[PDB]
Amino acid sequence: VEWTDKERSIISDIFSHMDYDDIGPKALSRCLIVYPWTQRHFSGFGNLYNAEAIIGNANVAAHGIKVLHGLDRGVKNMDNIAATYADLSTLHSEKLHVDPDNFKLLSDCITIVLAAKMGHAFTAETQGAFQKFLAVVVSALGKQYH
Amino acid sequence: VEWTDKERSIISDIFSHMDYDDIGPKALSRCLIVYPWTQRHFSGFGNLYNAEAIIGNANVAAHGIKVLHGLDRGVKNMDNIAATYADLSTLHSEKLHVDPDNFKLLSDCITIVLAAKMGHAFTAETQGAFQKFLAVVVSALGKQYH
Amino acid sequence: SLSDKDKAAVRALWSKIGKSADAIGNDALSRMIVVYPQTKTYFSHWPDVTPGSPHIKAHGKKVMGGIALAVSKIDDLKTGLMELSEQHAYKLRVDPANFKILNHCILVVISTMFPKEFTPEAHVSLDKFLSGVALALAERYR
Amino acid sequence: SLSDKDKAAVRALWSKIGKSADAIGNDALSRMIVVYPQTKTYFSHWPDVTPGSPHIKAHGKKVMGGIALAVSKIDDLKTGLMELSEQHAYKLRVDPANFKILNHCILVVISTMFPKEFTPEAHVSLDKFLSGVALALAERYR
Ligand code: HEM
Ligand code: HEM
Ligand code: HEM
Ligand code: HEM
Numbered sequence: 010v011e012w013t014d015k016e017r018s019i020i021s022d023i024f025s026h027m028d029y030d031d032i033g034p035k036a037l038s039r040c041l042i043v044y045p046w047t048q049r050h051f052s053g054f055g056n057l058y059n060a061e062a063i064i065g066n067a068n069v070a071a072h073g074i075k076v077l078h079g080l081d082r083g084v085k086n087m088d089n090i091a092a093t094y095a096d097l098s099t100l101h102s103e104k105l106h107v108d109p110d111n112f113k114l115l116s117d118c119i120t121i122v123l124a125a126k127m128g129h130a131f132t133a134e135t136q137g138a139f140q141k142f143l144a145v146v147v148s149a150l151g152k153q154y155h
Numbered sequence: 156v157e158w159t160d161k162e163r164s165i166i167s168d169i170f171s172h173m174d175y176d177d178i179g180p181k182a183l184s185r186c187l188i189v190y191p192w193t194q195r196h197f198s199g200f201g202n203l204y205n206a207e208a209i210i211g212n213a214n215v216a217a218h219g220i221k222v223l224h225g226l227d228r229g230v231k232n233m234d235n236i237a238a239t240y241a242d243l244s245t246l247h248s249e250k251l252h253v254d255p256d257n258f259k260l261l262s263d264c265i266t267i268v269l270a271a272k273m274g275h276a277f278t279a280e281t282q283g284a285f286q287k288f289l290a291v292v293v294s295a296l297g298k299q300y301h
Numbered sequence: 302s303l304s305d306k307d308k309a310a311v312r313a314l315w316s317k318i319g320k321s322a323d324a325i326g327n328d329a330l331s332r333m334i335v336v337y338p339q340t341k342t343y344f345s346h347w348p349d350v351t352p353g354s355p356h357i358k359a360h361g362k363k364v365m366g367g368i369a370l371a372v373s374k375i376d377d378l379k380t381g382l383m384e385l386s387e388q389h390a391y392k393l394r395v396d397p398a399n400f401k402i403l404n405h406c407i408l409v410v411i412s413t414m415f416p417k418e419f420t421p422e423a424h425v426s427l428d429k430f431l432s433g434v435a436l437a438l439a440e441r442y443r
Numbered sequence: 444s445l446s447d448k449d450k451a452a453v454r455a456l457w458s459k460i461g462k463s464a465d466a467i468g469n470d471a472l473s474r475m476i477v478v479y480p481q482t483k484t485y486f487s488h489w490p491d492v493t494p495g496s497p498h499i500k501a502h503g504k505k506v507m508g509g510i511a512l513a514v515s516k517i518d519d520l521k522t523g524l525m526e527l528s529e530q531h532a533y534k535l536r537v538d539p540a541n542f543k544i545l546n547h548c549i550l551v552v553i554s555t556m557f558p559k560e561f562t563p564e565a566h567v568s569l570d571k572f573l574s575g576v577a578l579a580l581a582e583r584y585r
Contacts, residue, residue: 042421043428045585049536060422106487110540117405121424124409125416133335133352136409140336154481188563189570191443195394206564252342256398263547267566270551271558279477279494282551286478300339302521302582379444425585436578440444443567 012087019138023123024084029077032122037073038063040118047111076115083146091149098153109151116143158233165284169269170230175220178268183219184210186264193257222261229292237295244299255297262289303429308375310426315372318415322369326361327353328410329403337402343395364403371434378437386441397442400435407431445571450517452568457514459560460553464511468503469495470552471545479544485537506545513576520579528583539584542577549573 040047041063048057054068063069079097086093101107120140124131187194187209194203200214209215225243232239247253266285270277303311318325331352333340347356367385374381389395408428412419419427445453460467473494475482486492493499509527516523531537550569554561 039421039424043425043585044538045532046536046538064421102484106484108484108538108541109481110538114538121408121412121419124412125419128413128416131409131413133332136332137336151481154484185563185566189443189567190396191390192394192396210563248339248342252345254342254396254399255339256396260396267550267554270554271561274555274558277551277555279474282474283478297339429585443571 015134016138016141017087019135020084020087020142023127023135023139024081027077028126029074032119032126033073033075033077034070035073036115036119036122037076038066038069039122040115041069043118044111044114046108047114050105050107077119080146083142083149090145091152094146094149095153098150101150102154109147109154112147112150116140116147119143162284162287163233165281166230166233166288169273169281169285170227173223174272175223178265178272179220179223180216181219181268182261182265183222184212184215185268186261187215189264190257190260192254193260196251196253223265226289226292229288229295236291237298240292240295241299244296247296248300255293255300258293258296262286262293265289303375303426303433307426307429310423311372311375311430314418314423314427315369317418318411319369319372321414322365323358323362325407325410325414326363326365327358328361328413329406330357330361330364332406332409333403336406340399340402343393343399368407368434371430371437375430378433379440382434382437383441386438389438390441397435397439400438404428404431404435445517445568445575449568449571452565453514453517453572456560456565456569457511460557461511461514463556464507465500465504467549467552467556468505468507469500470503470556471548472499472503472506474548474551475545478548482541482544485535485541510549510576513572513579517572517575520575521582524576524579525583528580531580532584539577539581542580546570546573546577 041051041057042060051057051069051072054072055066056062057066057069082093083090101109101112120136120143123139124136127135187197187203188206197203197215197218200218201212202208203212203215228239229236247255247258266282266289269285270282273281334344334350334357335352341350344350344356347354349356351357367382370385371378371382408424408431411427476486476492476499477494483492486498489496489498491498509524512527513520513524550566550573553569
C-alpha cells in the first residue's frame with residue numbers, strides 16, 4: 010500500500026492547519042537537545058552547549074521553519090516524492106554531509122511536537138498517516154547517498 | 156538503483172555454488188543460539204534449551220534447508236520479488252505469526268555463515284550485493300502484514 | 302546510564318502523570334497495534350486485537366504497572382525488573398526491537414496528554430530511562 | 444551485561460585473533476564504507492574514502508586498538524571507554540546507530556578470517572560484548 014484517500018485527506022488536513030512558526034523551531038530545537046549528535050551541522054549558529062541557549066537561538070528557530078517548509082513539496086506531489094526530493098537528497102549528501110539517520114530522528118521530533126499541538130486530535134489513525142508520510146520523505150532524502 | 160548486471164552476476168554465482176545442506180542448518184542453528192527469541196516458533200522441534208541440543212537437532216537442520224531454498228524463487232525472479240513472496244508473506248503473518256524482525260536476524264546469520272564458507276572470496280563487493288538481495292526478500296516477506 | 306539529573310527528572314514527571322497510567326497504557330498500546338501492525342504477532346491468542354479492546358485496555362494497565370515498578374527501582378533496573386525479564390525471555394519470547402517501538406508510542410501519548418510538562422529536558426531523561434527499561438527487560442534473554 | 448562465560452569467551456577469542464587486529468580493522472572499515480555508503484559522511488575530511496586506502500588502513504588500526512582496550516577493560520566498559528566516549532560525543536558527533544553497522548562488519552570479517560574459532564558460542568558472547576562497547580561509547584552523548 011501507497012496512498013488511500015483517507016491518508017490523502019489527513020495529510021492535507023494536517024498541512025492546511027500547520028503553524029510553521031510554532032512547530033518548526035520547536036521540532037529542530039527538540040532534536041538538537043534529545044539527539045545532540047545532530048549539532049554537527051550547526052557550527053557558527055552560536056552557542057548550543059546548553060538546552061536554554063538552544064531554545065533561544067534565532068538561527069535554530071529560522072532553520073527549523075526552513076526544514077518544516079521543505080515538506081510542502083512532498084505534500085503537493087504525493088505520488089512523486091522520490092523524484093521531487095532527489096535534489097535535496099544530493100545536497101544533504103555531497104555538500105552538507107549529513108548522516109541520513111538524522112532525517113529519521115528529526116521526523117520523530119516533528120511527530121512529538123505536532124502531537125503536543127493537536128492533543129486528542131492526534132489519533133492513532135492520524136499518527137499512522139503522518140508517520141507514513143514522513144517515512145516516505147526520509148526514504149527519498151537518503152536515496153542519492155553513494 | 157535496482158539491479159546492475161554485476162549484482163545479477165554475483166547473485167547468480169553465489170547461488171549456483173550454494174551448499175544448502177551445509178549453510179542451511181548452520182544459519183538457522185546459529186540464529187537460535189544468537190537470537191533465542193526466534194525459538195518462539197519451534198516447540199515440537201525437540202529440545203533447544205542449550206547450544207549443543209540445537210546444533211544437533213535434525214528438525215532444525217531440515218528447516219534450515221527449507222528456508223534457504225526459499226530464496227531460490229527470488230533468484231529466478233529478480234525483477235519481481237514482492238509479487239513472488241506475497242504468498243509466503245501471508246503465510247508467516249497469518250498462520251505462523253512470525254515477528255518480521257526475525258527475518259532480518261536470520262539474514263545476518265545467513266550472511267555470517269556464507270562469509271565463513273567463502274572466506275576471502277566474500278569480498279566487500281559480494282557482501283554488498285548479497286545483503287541487497289536479502290534485504291529485498293525481507294522487505295517482501297514483511298509486506299503482507301496488516 | 303541515568304544521571305542523578307535524569308533520575309530527578311523522571312521521578313518528578315512520574316509524580317505528575319503517574320495518576321493517568323492506565324489511560325496512557327491503553328492509548329500507547331492502541332497506537333502500537335495500529336501504527337505498527339507487525340507487533341500484532343504477539344497477541345494472536347486474543348480475538349480482539351483492536352484499539353481500546355477490553356484486552357488492550359487491561360494489558361495497557363499491566364504494562365504501565367511495570368513502568369511504575371521501574372520508576373521505583375530506578376536505581377537498579379537490572380535487578381528490579383528481573384522477573385519481568387524472565388517472563389519476556391522464556392515465556393513470551395518478545396524480540397526486544399519491539400521495546401523501542403512501544404517506547405516511541407509512550408512518548409507520543411505523554412506528549413498528547415501533558416504538553417506543558419513534556420519539555421525537551423524531560424524528554425531527554427525519559428528517553429534515556431525507557432531505553433534503560435528496554436535493556437533491563439532484555440537482560441535474561443541470552 | 445556480560446556474564447563470566449561471556450568475558451572468558453571474548454578473552455579467549457581475542458587471545459587467538461588479537462595479532463591480526465590491524466588486518467581486521469582495515470577489512471571491516473572497507474566493508475562499512477562500501478556496504479553502507481551513508482557512513483562516508485563522517486570521512487568527508489579525507490580525499491580517499493576508498494576501500495583499503497592509506498587513511499582507511501590507518502583508522503582501521505585505531506578502531507581495532509579501541510576494541511583491544513575494551514577487551515582489557517571488559518569488567519567496566521563504561522569507565523574504561525570514558526575518554527573515547529567524549530571524543531565521539533563532543534568532537535565527532537557520531538550517530539550511535541553507526542556503531543551497530545560497524546559491529547556487524549566486524550563479525551563478518553572475523554567470520555571470514557577465523558571460521559573455526561567463530562563458533563555460535565563465541566558469536567553470542569562477542570555480539571553481547573560489541574553491543575556493550577556500543578553502549579559504553581554512547582555514555583557521554585546526553
Ligand atoms: C525531514 C528531514 C529534512 C528535510 C525535509 C530538510 C530540508 C532542507 C531543505 C529544503 C534545505 C534547503 C536549503 C537550500 O536550498 O540551501 C535544507 C538545508 C539544510 N539542512 Fe536539511 N532537512 C532535513 C533534515 C535535516 C537534518 C536532520 C539536518 C541536521 C542534522 C539538516 C541540516 C541542514 C543544513 C545544515 C542545511 C543548510 C542550511 C544553510 O543553508 O545554512 N537537515 N534542509
Ligand atoms: C529469509 C527468511 C525466511 C524465508 C525465505 C523463509 C522461508 C520459508 C518457506 C519457503 C516456508 C515454506 C513452508 C511451506 O510452504 O509449508 C517456511 C515455513 C516456515 N517458516 Fe519461514 N522463512 C524465513 C524466515 C523464518 C523465520 C525467521 C522464522 C521464525 C523466526 C520462520 C518460521 C517458519 C515456520 C515455523 C514455518 C512452518 C514450517 C512447518 O512446520 O512446516 N521462517 N519458511
Ligand atoms: C515498556 C516495555 C514493557 C513492559 C514494562 C512490559 C510489561 C509487561 C508486564 C508487566 C506483563 C505481565 C502482566 C501480568 O503480570 O500478567 C507483560 C505481558 C506481556 N507483554 Fe510485555 N511489557 C513491555 C513491552 C512489551 C512489548 C513491546 C511486547 C510485544 C510486542 C510485549 C508483549 C507482552 C505479552 C504478549 C504479554 C502477555 C500478555 C497476555 O497474554 O496477557 N511486552 N508485559
Ligand atoms: C567499534 C566502535 C568504534 C571504536 C572502538 C572507535 C574508536 C575510535 C578511536 C580510538 C578513534 C581516535 C584516535 C585518535 O585520533 O585519538 C576514533 C576516531 C574516529 N572515529 Fe571512531 N570508533 C568506533 C566507531 C566509529 C564509527 C561507527 C564511526 C562512523 C562511521 C566512527 C568515526 C570516527 C571518526 C570520524 C574518527 C576520527 C578519525 C580521523 O579523523 O582520522 N567511529 N574512533
